[PDB]
Each structure stands twice: as C-alpha cells, then as structure tokens.
Design an enzyme around this catalytic site. Structure first.
Site, mmCIF file in Angstrom:
data_model
loop_
_atom_site.group_PDB
_atom_site.id
_atom_site.type_symbol
_atom_site.label_atom_id
_atom_site.label_comp_id
_atom_site.label_asym_id
_atom_site.label_seq_id
_atom_site.Cartn_x
_atom_site.Cartn_y
_atom_site.Cartn_z
ATOM 1 C CG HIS A 60 -0.434 -0.252 2.543
ATOM 2 N ND1 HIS A 60 -0.433 -1.541 3.029
ATOM 3 C CD2 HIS A 60 0.155 0.541 3.441
ATOM 4 C CE1 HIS A 60 0.096 -1.508 4.245
ATOM 5 N NE2 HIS A 60 0.481 -0.271 4.516
ATOM 6 C CG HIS A 92 -0.112 8.541 2.080
ATOM 7 N ND1 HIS A 92 -0.886 7.455 2.149
ATOM 8 C CD2 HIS A 92 0.509 8.671 3.278
ATOM 9 C CE1 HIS A 92 -0.765 6.891 3.374
ATOM 10 N NE2 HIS A 92 0.034 7.624 4.033
ATOM 11 C CG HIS A 115 2.169 10.685 6.979
ATOM 12 N ND1 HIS A 115 1.228 9.864 6.406
ATOM 13 C CD2 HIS A 115 1.673 11.962 6.914
ATOM 14 C CE1 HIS A 115 0.208 10.602 6.017
ATOM 15 N NE2 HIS A 115 0.431 11.894 6.315
ATOM 16 C CB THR A 194 -4.150 8.305 7.028
ATOM 17 O OG1 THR A 194 -2.892 7.846 6.525
ATOM 18 C CG2 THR A 194 -4.096 9.571 7.850
ATOM 19 C CB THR A 195 -3.476 2.887 6.369
ATOM 20 O OG1 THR A 195 -2.654 2.581 7.506
ATOM 21 C CG2 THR A 195 -2.876 3.762 5.282
#
Ligand SMILES: [Zn+2]
EC number: 4.2.1.1
Length: 255
Positions: A60, A92, A115, A194-195
């Site tokens: 991811h 991201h 991040h 955020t995941t």
C-alpha cells in the site's frame, strides 16, 4: 483493504468501524478557522543520530524503517509531552500532480504527503503506544512539484529494487534531515492513523511549508506496484485517504 473501487476508503468501515469515529484523519485544514495558540512551543527534531535499516513495499506504500531501540532520532516540544521516537517514514501520492496529499489546506491538495511516524517512549514499544490517545506523533510534510530535492534522491534510486509487494532492501545511512522544509511552523490537532486499523492514537503536526520535488522524482513513485511479483500489474498511485469530518475538534497553529 486497499485503494481500489472495491476495497477503497469508502469500504474500510465494514472491517474497521472506527473508520467513522470521532477523531479520524486526514482533515481539511481551514486556515481562517485554525486558532493561533501562543502556548505552543517550537518543535524539537533531533535526528543527527538516526539509523535507517531498510525500505520495503508493503503493498500500500513504501516504508523506510529505523532502529528505535534507543533515543536516536527523536521529536519533542510543540504540543507534545515526553519523547517520541522515530520508527518509520512513508509517503502517499497520486496519479497526477493535482492530487496525492492526505491532509489538505483550504481544500488544496498537494502532489504527495510524507509522514514521519513516532511513538511515545513512556509506553515502551510501538504496539503499546498505538493503544494510547497520546501514543503517536506524526509529522506531516507536503510535497509540491518544482525543483528536485537532493535529499530525496537516495530513496528514488532504490524504488527499482522494491517494485512489488513484499520486497525489501537494505537502506542504511539515510539522513531524514534532508527531507525537512526550512520552517517548522505547524498546525496541530488530534487524529488517527490514515490506514487501517485507523487507531485514533495520533497527535498530528502538519508543517505549513511544503517541500518541492521534481517531476521525475515523483514519476518514479508512480512506477511502484500494489501487487506481488508474478501478478497482474496494478500501479501504486492514489494511496491517499479523503478528508474526514472535523467534528468539533479544533486545529491550532504555532504561527
Ligand atoms: Zn502515511
């Protein structure tokens, strides 16, 4: 879970009900509404002694991991209490330059978002920290397309080695200080990962000032694969989550 039509963000709440919780991230930062708080202290980034180990494609995104057995790379100051240790940094990004960041400013989306993840040393390990409200600290840095980011290139050149899901590569002697903007002025608010599992354990610290990257740097990010090796190729693009409702929470600014 993933970022496709069938397993994307809009479907995460079925496996992870916190998805619709009270302190979900990312959020849209409204600058006219964010409150300037004079009681916020400057950020304290001590990364001279950081020790990178490796880079991996977890399906991811790609993560650079650090040795977090000692206070080698630490964050303190700001709205934080106690010392938070640097465990990993991830990005991201989007299919286009017009999208990619998770957090947004005045509804403006940046090309990507970096991040830096840290965990509260008072809790002893990363796994205990994610069970706490003040458990983690994430430094968010916005990337915009302009000139090349010299400090970013070592990461860029190793992506070829981790194209597919599950791949990892030795990644020592990487200095995180090369990814930082000139200013440490920031916005802060309470949120979550955020995941999945979207644990509402984070203290967000979003830098006001973005870093610029060249077109060709970001291009190599888009050559990554979601899929494992020997499978139909799915480019790793748009691994970002949409803005969630603020719901009462207040965003403070250090400027
Ligand atoms: Zn991230």
């Amino acid at each position: 879970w993933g970022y496709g039509k069938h397993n994307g963000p809009e479907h995460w709440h079925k496996d992870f009900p916190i998805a619709k919780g009270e302190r979900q991230s990312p959020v849209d930062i409204d600058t006219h509404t964010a409150k300037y708080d004079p009681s916020l202290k400057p950020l304290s980034v001590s990364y001279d002694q950081a020790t990178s180990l490796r880079i991996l494609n977890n399906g991811h995104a790609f993560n650079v991991e650090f040795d977090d057995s000692q206070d080698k790379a630490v964050l303190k100051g700001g709205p934080l209490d106690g010392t938070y240790r640097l465990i990993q940094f991830d990005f991201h990004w989007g299919s286009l330059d017009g999208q990619g960041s998770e957090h947004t400013v005045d509804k403006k989306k940046y090309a990507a978002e970096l991040h830096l993840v840290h965990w509260n040393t008072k809790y002893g390990d990363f796994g205990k920290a994610v069970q706490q409200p003040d458990g983690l600290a994430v430094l968010g840095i916005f990337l915009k397309v302009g000139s090349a980011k010299p400090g970013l290139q070592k990461v860029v050149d190793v992506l070829d080695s981790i194209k597919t899901k599950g791949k990892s590569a030795d990644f020592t002697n990487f200095d995180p200080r090369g990814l930082l903007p000139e200013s440490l002025d920031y916005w802060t608010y309470p949120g979550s990962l955020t995941t999945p599992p979207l644990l509402e354990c984070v203290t967000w610290i979003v830098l006001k000032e973005p870093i610029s990257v060249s077109s060709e740097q970001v291009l190599k990010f888009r050559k990554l694969n979601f899929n494992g090796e020997g499978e139909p190729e799915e480019l790793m693009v748009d691994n970002w989550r949409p803005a969630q409702p603020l719901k009462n929470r207040q965003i403070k600014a250090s400027f």
